[PDB]
Paper text:
Calpain-I and calpain-II are the two most studied members of a family of calcium dependent cysteine proteases that currently comprises fifteen identified gene products in humans. These heterodimeric proteases are composed of a large subunit with a molecular mass of ∼80 000 and a small subunit of mass ∼30 000. Selective inhibitors might not only be potential drugs but should act as tools to explore the physiological and pathophysiological roles of calpain-I. α-Mercaptoacrylic acid based calpain inhibitors are potent, cell permeable and selective inhibitors of calpain-I and calpain-II. These inhibitors target the calcium binding domain PEF(S) of calpain-I and -II.
The interaction of (Z)-3-(6-bromoindole-3-yl)-2-mercaptoacrylic acid with human PEF(S) was investigated by single crystal X-ray crystallography. Human PEF(S) was produced in E. coli, purified to apparent homogeneity, crystallised and soaked with 3 as previously described for other α-mercaptoacrylic acids. With the exception of a hydrogen bond between the carboxylate of 3 and the side chain amide group of Gln175 in chain B, van der Waals forces are the main interactions observed between 3 and the residues of both monomers of the protein. Based on the X-ray crystal structure of PEF(S) bound to (Z)-3-(6-bromoindol-2-yl)-2-mercaptoacrylic acid, oxidised α-mercaptoacrylic acids such as 4 were designed to target the full calpastatin binding cavity.
Residue numbers in the entry:
A (entry chain A), B (entry chain B): 96 to 268
The structure:
């Protein structure tokens, strides 16, 4: 019944326009995090969810269709399990000492410099990251690796991006 | 006096660490918009302000020093003026039809496709944009032009980046 239950979840969440908006996404994430007192969060806010939608909206409809939403949801299901596992003291938050192992478990092997930038952008003044910040960072990180991979057809590890493409990739994010 | 008053504003806003954080920025922007009822807004949120700080934080300290803050504030001043001037129907919001005129006044000449993305990302279902979303969009857009230019000295309209560079550019934003 897994396929069936999920199609049902998408149908009811997407509603009358058959796609998942930022508001719909915000609502479901917040509902689910209500049941997980181990995930400390101030909530998923609408601007975070608009960025989430835009980076996952690869056909540029403004909203998440079934396959887009399925990809996002399955990544979050995995990433939440990682966050719980790497929260090796039950603060409910991922501190700087815990972050590299968490990201590496998700398949993101970054260097100290990158980890440092991520912490400045997504963690608080103590270096702790809450759950909605952790998911919004990973959704973006995954999308940016995928964008790079899409543009590096020749597998040279360098991509050439023109201004139109630069603006599209950065503004619709 | 302008010079003197502004130093006082920065000093009081930045407080004990001598730089302006995202929280401090959020608090001043919200205090200031409330005195401009001709600028409609649901408020500036913390995630939006973290994004604003990141794109304005040229020396990667995590927070805005005096010249970074001055740059941002002077832009906001100019853009709020444009907002009021191009809200021709006096709605307090900038609709899809008013947007190009506003953006052209701010010096940006974008193609249809990129307006469509911007409206999807920043406007409401009707295509109307409130003031915090307009400012957030402009801050970002100005920054993204500046970043590309700083990397494309000889105006080829293309930059070349490796994965490390790409992630630094896209995740610290
Ligand atoms: O604990 C579990 O078994 C599952 S399947 C967790 C989640 C599955 N989807 C999630 C979304 C958010 Br938001 C937080 C937690 C979950
Ligand atoms: O209209 C004016 O005279 C000025 S000094 C406007 C502003 C100058 N800085 C601002 C910040 C926000 Br938020 C809203 C309005 C302004
Ligand atoms: Ca819907
Ligand atoms: Ca879509
Ligand atoms: Ca922890
Ligand atoms: Ca948060
Ligand atoms: Ca400060
Ligand atoms: Ca700085
Ligand atoms: Ca208007
Ligand atoms: Ca808004």
């Amino acid at each position: 019944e897994e396929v069936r239950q999920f199609r049902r979840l998408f149908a009811q969440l997407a509603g009358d326009d058959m796609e998942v908006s930022a508001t719909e996404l915000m609502n479901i994430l917040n509902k689910v995090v209500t049941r997980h007192p181990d995930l400390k969060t101030d909530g998923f806010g609408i601007d975070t969810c608009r960025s989430m939608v835009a980076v996952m909206d690869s056909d540029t409809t403004g909203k998440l269709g079934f396959e887009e939403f399925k990809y996002l949801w399955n990544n979050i299901k995995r990433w939440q399990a990682i966050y719980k596992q790497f929260d090796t003291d039950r603060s409910g938050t991922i501190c700087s000492s815990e972050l590299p192992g968490a990201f590496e478990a998700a398949g993101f092997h970054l260097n100290e410099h990158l980890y440092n930038m991520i912490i400045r952008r997504y963690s608080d003044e103590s270096g702790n990251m809450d759950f909605d910040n952790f998911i919004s960072c990973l959704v973006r990180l995954d999308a940016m690796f995928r964008a790079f991979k899409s543009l590096d057809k020749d597998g040279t590890g360098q991509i050439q991006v023109n201004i139109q493409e630069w603006l599209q990739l950065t503004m619709y994010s």
